[PDB]
Every structure is written in C-alpha cells, then in structure tokens.
Amino acid sequence: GSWTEHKSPDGRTYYYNTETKQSTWEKPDD
C-alpha cells in the first residue's frame, strides 16, 4: 500500500508507486 493516485495536468489519472518509484496508467491491481 504505497501507490499514490496523481492525475496529469492534462486530465489523466495515473498511479505512481512510492516503493518502486514507478508510474502506470492502470490500477495497481491489474
């Protein structure tokens, strides 16, 4: 449980893991 939900300034909700310092467009439970 270390995934932060942040949306781009263009209107794109993306998830970013603080543990792996990675980012994705799909939920962490894909």
DSSP summary, beta strand count: 3
Residues in helices, as a percent range:
under 10%
Beta-strand portion reads over 45%
Largest sheet: 3 strands, antiparallel
Our count of helices gives 0
Please provide the ordered H/E string of secondary-structure elements: EEE
Cα separation of the termini? 15 Å
Secondary structure category: mainly beta
Tell me the Rg in angstroms.
Answer: 9 Å
Characterize the overall form.
Answer: globular
| Arrangement of strands in the largest sheet | 1-2-3
PDB class: signaling protein
Keywords: beta sheet, Structural Genomics, signaling protein
Assembly: monomeric
Entry title: Solution structure of the first WW domain of FBP11
Word description of this protein:
The PDB classes it as signaling protein. The entry lists the keywords beta sheet, Structural Genomics, nppsfa, National Project on Protein Structural and Functional Analyses, RIKEN Structural Genomics/Proteomics Initiative, rsgi, signaling protein. It forms a monomeric assembly. The entry is titled "Solution structure of the first WW domain of FBP11". The protein: huntingtin-interacting protein HYPA/FBP11. Organism: Homo sapiens. The chain has 30 residues and is an all-beta fold. The chain has strands at residues 3-8, 12-17, 22-24. Strands 1-2-3 form a 3-stranded antiparallel beta sheet, with no helix packed on it. A hairpin with a 3-residue loop joins strand 1 (3-8) and strand 2 (12-17). The radius of gyration is 9 Å and the shape is globular.
